[PDB]
Amino acid sequence: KMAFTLADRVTEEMLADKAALVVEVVEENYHDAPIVGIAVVNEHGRFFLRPETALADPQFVAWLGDETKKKSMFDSKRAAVALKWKGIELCGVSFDLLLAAYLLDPAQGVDDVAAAAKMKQYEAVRPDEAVYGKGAKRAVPDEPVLAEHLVRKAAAIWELERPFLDELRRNEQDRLLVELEQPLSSILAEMEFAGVKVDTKRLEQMGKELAEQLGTVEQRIYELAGQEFNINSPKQLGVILFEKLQLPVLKKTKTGYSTSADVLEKLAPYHEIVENILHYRQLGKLQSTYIEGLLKVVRPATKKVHTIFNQALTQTGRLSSTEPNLQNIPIRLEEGRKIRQAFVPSESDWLIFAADYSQIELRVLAHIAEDDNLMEAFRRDLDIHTKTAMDIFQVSEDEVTPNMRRQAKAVNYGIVYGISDYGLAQNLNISRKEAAEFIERYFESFPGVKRYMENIVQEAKQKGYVTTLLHRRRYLPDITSRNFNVRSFAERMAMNTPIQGSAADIIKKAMIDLNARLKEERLQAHLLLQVHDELILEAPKEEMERLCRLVPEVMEQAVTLRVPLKVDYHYGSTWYDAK
DNA sequence: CCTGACTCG
DNA sequence: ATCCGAGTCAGG
Numbered sequence: 017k018m019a020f021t022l023a024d025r026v027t028e029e030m031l032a033d034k035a036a037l038v039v040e041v042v043e044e045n046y047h048d049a050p051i052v053g054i055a056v057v058n059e060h061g062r063f064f065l066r067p068e069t070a071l072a073d074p075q076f077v078a079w080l081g082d083e084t085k086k087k088s089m090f091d092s093k094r095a096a097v098a099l100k101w102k103g104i105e106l107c108g109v110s111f112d113l114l115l116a117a118y119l120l121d122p123a124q125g126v127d128d129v130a131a132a133a134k135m136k137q138y139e140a141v142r143p144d145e146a147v148y149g150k151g152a153k154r155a156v157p158d159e160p161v162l163a164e165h166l167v168r169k170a171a172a173i174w175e176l177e178r179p180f181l182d183e184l185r186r187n188e189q190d191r192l193l194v195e196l197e198q199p200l201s202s203i204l205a206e207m208e209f210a211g212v213k214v215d216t217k218r219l220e221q222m223g224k225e226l227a228e229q230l231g232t233v234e235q236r237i238y239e240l241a242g243q244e245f246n247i248n249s250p251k252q253l254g255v256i257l258f259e260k261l262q263l264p265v266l267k268k269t270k271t272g273y274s275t276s277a278d279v280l281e282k283l284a285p286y287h288e289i290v291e292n293i294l295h296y297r298q299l300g301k302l303q304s305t306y307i308e309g310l311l312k313v314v315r316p317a318t319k320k321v322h323t324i325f326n327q328a329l330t331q332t333g334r335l336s337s338t339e340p341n342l343q344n345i346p347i348r349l350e351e352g353r354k355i356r357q358a359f360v361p362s363e364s365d366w367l368i369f370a371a372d373y374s375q376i377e378l379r380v381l382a383h384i385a386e387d388d389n390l391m392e393a394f395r396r397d398l399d400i401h402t403k404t405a406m407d408i409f410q411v412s413e414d415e416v417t418p419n420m421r422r423q424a425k426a427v428n429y430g431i432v433y434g435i436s437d438y439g440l441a442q443n444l445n446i447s448r449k450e451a452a453e454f455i456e457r458y459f460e461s462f463p464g465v466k467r468y469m470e471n472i473v474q475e476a477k478q479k480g481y482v483t484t485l486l487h488r489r490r491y492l493p494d495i496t497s498r499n500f501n502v503r504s505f506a507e508r509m510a511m512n513t514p515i516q517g518s519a520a521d522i523i524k525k526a527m528i529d530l531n532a533r534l535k536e537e538r539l540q541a542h543l544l545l546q547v548h549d550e551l552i553l554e555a556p557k558e559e560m561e562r563l564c565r566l567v568p569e570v571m572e573q574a575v576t577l578r579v580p581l582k583v584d585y586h587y588g589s590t591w592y593d594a595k
Numbered sequence: 596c597c598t599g600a601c602t603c604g
Numbered sequence: 605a606t607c608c609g610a611g612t613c614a615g616g
């Protein structure tokens with residue numbers, strides 16, 4: 017049905033200046049993964065190329081790297097990074113169908129071309145899973161079957177571009193695609209390929225010392241319990257706590273007794289064993305995930321880890337980070353924080369530089385809600401996380417520890433994003449009446465925030481979606497639901513999404529601005545990671561002074577709000593020391 | 596394979 | 605019933 021040339025060699029007509037390009041990587045983690053086939057669709061026709069042929073062809077490599085030869089693709093970051101591992105530069109990506117679909121509707125969870133095509137009732141292409149299979153059965157099919165699939169995906173991209181661009185334009189999201197998400201994709205590609213260097217000697221020694229400590233804590237828990245059991249089994253643990261030891265049952269889930277951290281903390285007045293168990297479960301996660309799990313994914317020759325930043329996953333416009341997740345490295349407890357000493361610069365005499373937006377969603381909220389009490393607190397450079405702390409612990413602005421401030425930060429965001437008196441009461445282990453009284457006084461200090469949250473909920477019910485500063489959108493069909501729980505969740509998404517998503521928009525723009533700046537000043541410094549409202553770079557020790565001005569500046573100037581954006585920063589010999 | 600742990604923003 | 609957004613892991 018669909019005619020294409022199964023080419024044995026690259027020809028001139030394949031190198032047109034506009035094309036849909038497919039560079040197929042079957043493995044989910046595309047780092048150093050095989051490219052199994054290439055397809056090109058342009059004005060002159062449809063072509064399948066063998067990677068061995070095409071990627072060793074100097075005209076084709078030239079064309080890939082030519083920014084004036086425009087390519088339309090699906091998930092160009094995947095292709096760009098796979099090509100980098102093949103030592104080939106990909107330039108000229110002008111349209112990314114994945115990112116287009118994601119902006120039109122993040123809820124569709126589009127993750128292959130077929131799923132994007134479905135959005136415009138385009139059905140002349142198969143889902144990847146149907147072609148490659150799943151799990152132990154996953155495999156590249158016979159060449160003619162593979163070639164047709166890749167060509168059909170290219171043909172789909174070729175035909176779907178205008179219809180997607182048109183709809184994006186109708187939604188005012190065209191610039192969000194072309195000026196924000198697509199340039200960010202190339203930047204993330206650079207960051208993933210660069211990777212972050214790991215001190216495996218240090219990590220392995222931490223691991224050995226952690227194993228000894230675990231055994232010690234383990235034995236202590238068995239002594240306290242009067243029995244050996246699997247502490248890492250909530251089921252077995254529940255039997256020990258609520259049957260053998262007869263501690264009060266505070267919560268159940270569908271599977272049985274809850275042994276959540278919140279529940280165990282509340283049981284501390286009944287038996288000291290619950291504090292030891294909380295400690296054990298923390299240490300065990302450090303070992304399984306941040307020592308063993310991390311060492312498993314280190315590339316042994318370079319000692320680097322290469323995360324994948326999923327740019328088309330979260331419902332709010334944030335990135336996520338996978339395999340490994342480098343956006344959830346411990347920091348809150350010193351015991352875990354020490355893992356960060358194993359993340360080091362990739363060159364000698366280089367340093368890690370970390371910058372963090374201050375009270376970021378509180379600033380964005382002030383701007384969007386136009387709450388005058390709040391817009392003012394930032395014009396007076398107040399720290400609302402700390403003030404809240406002083407209040408909930410009756411402790412004053414000098415005595416507030418980082419930990420207390422951390423807790424207050426969850427209270428602040430909790431309240432603005434719709435926590436109930438019950439939730440705040442369970443969170444601070446205080447009485448519900450007191451919690452309710454606190455929420456009351458909070459919205460008295462910031463009446464505009466309260467008005468904004470009431471108004472954005474009604475607007476969501478009327479329109480069926482909410483939007484961010486740069487026109488990112490989330491649909492919320494459930495919000496007019498007759499069901500209280502379903503409706504309630506949707507209402508709180510209406511309160512939170514515009515704010516968290518606007519904050520995502522901002523740091524994304526900041527990353528693009530920051531890179532352009534690094535280049536024009538010919539600095540060696542480059543981004544390693546983004547952590548939602550943090551940017552982490554590495555650079556020669558001599559560029560620290562310049563970065564101390566460049567980075568906070570670019571991040572603060574990414575957008576202009578009705579309040580000051582404020583960025584905190586540090587650098588040091590390891591990520592840990594960048595404090 | 597999911598659930599409930601722990602981790603982060 | 606009860607702030608929001610994420611990922612990985614051991615146990616089952």
Ligand SMILES: Nc1nc2c(ncn2[C@H]2CC[C@@H](COP(=O)(O)OP(=O)(O)OP(=O)(O)O)O2)c(=O)[nH]1
Pocket residue numbers: 372373374375376377378401425426429430433512548549604607608
């Ligand atoms: N709904 C919600 N969002 C949170 C919570 N913690 C963090 N976030 C979101 C909101 C802020 C954003 C950044 O995290 P941070 O810890 O840096 O919070 P921050 O407000 O910027 O504080 P800081 O001034 O210390 O940098 O991520 C939380 O407990 N609930």
Ligand SMILES: [Mg+2]
Pocket residue numbers: 372373374375376549
């Ligand atoms: Mg911050």
